[PDB]
Design a protein around this ligand. Structure first.
Ligand SMILES: CNc1cc(N2CCC3(CC2)CN(c2ccc(CN4CCC(C)(C)CC4)cc2)CC(=O)N3)ncn1
Lengths: 202, 241
């Protein structure tokens, strides 16, 4: 079912095995990076424990990182069973195409790319590993990442973890704790959800 | 701009524009810089211990096989065995060129092997304004258009991007901008560039490399530049009179 679908929940406690297998996974986790907290983070062990491995047999994982999560994110990526094969960096500009941890000012954000199994029929090499785009809102990711992913694997099932309302996209299932309820349209998914959650509560 | 690159062959970085005066800092680095010293050495075969005293900054630019994907390469196997910890000051800095493939993981293993924490990921983005494609690594998912230079610290102004146009096929030079970033950090004056070439030799820097055609290195002459009262200068202050 091509149109947007989402699930409000806690990704820690949701049983993601009901969701099926996806050609692409994306996650922009709330890493417990440096001190303080504008939102609710997850501990390193909670990130290690996330049941990412069930979501894919063959395909690609996209994993935003920052600070020490560049190392941590590589550990989860490896533990969950992926090989890191690319790394996308987003160069943050303004509307006039000029450039906008403590040793160096940070002009970019990194997104690790991992592979699991042997994906086949993907248009590898279409885009390049750099993204240039205006910073729309703080803590948001650039919409271009969706276009790059669609061109790489057109028409396939994709799932985003730790999304927010603006992230909902056709061909995607968005999981996040700030979404409005449970909006699901794919029959096979609706079935397994009702089976696992007959009273509708994770 | 990612759709545009899919359309026209112009990498998104082609369209970045603009790519007070810290000119006083540039002059204080210049006055403080030691004479350029250089030594040709087969670093494979060379005891990295004869390189004394211990170094405040190390710039490490080993020749990766991927730099010749069009034209002695070093594997990450060979690099990881260099005894970098033996010649680093107890508080010191490394900048390691990692390319864009396995190096971004293996280079982090090296930094941890020699005792550093990664503090900065400096990214060299290459525009292709003068030739709007690339033959990809088998594992590659996207076209690779950047290289990473990892910065590590051990012990207790600028941006993390360098934008130049992609060099001519089989030109392996890294942007000279890397040296400005390092110098502007004022990390100390004992600076070593391993696998430099004749073309990278530079004031305030000791260059060691297999392809150097001349050497002038003398450990006692080198040590004299840092004997008291100059042992602790940042490289950014006035000379002691
Ligand atoms: C407790 N378990 C949860 C939690 C949860 N969510 C829902 C969505 C969520 C986090 C909690 C996103 N978040 C956030 C903020 C910043 C970053 C860092 N990133 C910013 C974008 C980038 C620069 C491109 C790359 C770096 C990542 C995530 C803020 C927010 O409010 N919500 N959903 C289900 N279970």
């Amino acid at each position: 079912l091509f149109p947007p679908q989402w699930i409000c929940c806690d990704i820690r406690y949701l049983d993601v095995s009901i969701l099926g297998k996806f050609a692409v996974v994306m996650a922009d986790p709330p890493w417990d990076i440096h001190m303080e907290l504008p939102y609710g983070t997850l501990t390193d062990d909670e990130m290690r424990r996330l049941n990412i491995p069930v979501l894919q047999d063959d395909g690609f994982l996209f994993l935003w990182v920052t600070g020490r999560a560049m190392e941590l994110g590589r550990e989860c990526l490896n533990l969950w069973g992926y090989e890191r094969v690319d790394e996308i960096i987003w160069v943050k500009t303004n509307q006039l195409q000029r450039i906008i941890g403590h040793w160096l000012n940070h002009g970019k954000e990194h997104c690790l790319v991992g592979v699991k199994g042997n994906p086949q029929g993907f248009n590898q090499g279409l885009d390049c590993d750099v993204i240039v785009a205006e910073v729309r809102s703080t803590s948001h990711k650039p919409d271009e990442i969706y276009g790059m992913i669609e061109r790489l694997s057109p028409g396939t099932r994709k799932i985003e973890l730790f999304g927010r309302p603006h992230n909902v996209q056709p061909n995607w299932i968005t999981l996040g704790n700030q979404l409005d309820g449970i909006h699901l349209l794919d029959p096979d998914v609706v079935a397994r959800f009702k089976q696992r959650y007959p009273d509708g509560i994770i | 701009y990612c759709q545009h690159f899919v359309d026209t062959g112009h990498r998104p970085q082609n369209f970045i524009r603009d790519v007070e005066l810290i000119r006083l800092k540039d002059e204080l680095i210049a006055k403080s810089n030691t004479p350029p010293m250089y030594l040709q050495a087969d670093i494979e075969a060379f005891d990295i211990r004869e390189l004394t005293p211990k170094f405040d900054v190390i710039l490490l630019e080993p020749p990766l096989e991927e730099y010749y994907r069009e034209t002695k390469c070093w594997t990450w196997d060979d690099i990881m065995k260099l005894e970098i910890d033996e010649i680093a000051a107890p508080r010191s800095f490394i900048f390691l060129w990692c390319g864009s493939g396995e190096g971004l993981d293996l280079g982090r293993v090296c930094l941890r092997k020699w005792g550093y924490r990664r503090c900065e990921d400096i990214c060299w983005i290459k525009t292709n304004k003068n030739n709007p494609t690339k033959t990809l690594d088998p594992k590659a998912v996207f076209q690779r258009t950047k290289e990473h230079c990892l910065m590590g610290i051990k012990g207790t102004v600028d941006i993390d991007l360098i934008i130049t146009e992609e060099p001519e096929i089989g030109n392996i030079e890294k942007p000279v901008e890397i040296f400005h970033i390092i110098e502007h950090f004022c990390l100390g004056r004992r600076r070593l560039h391993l696998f430099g070439r004749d073309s990278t030799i530079r004031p305030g820097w000791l260059t060691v490399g297999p392809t150097l055609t001349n050497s002038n290195y003398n450990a006692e002459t080198y040590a004299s530049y840092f004997s008291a009262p100059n042992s602790y200068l940042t490289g950014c202050t006035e000379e002691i009179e």
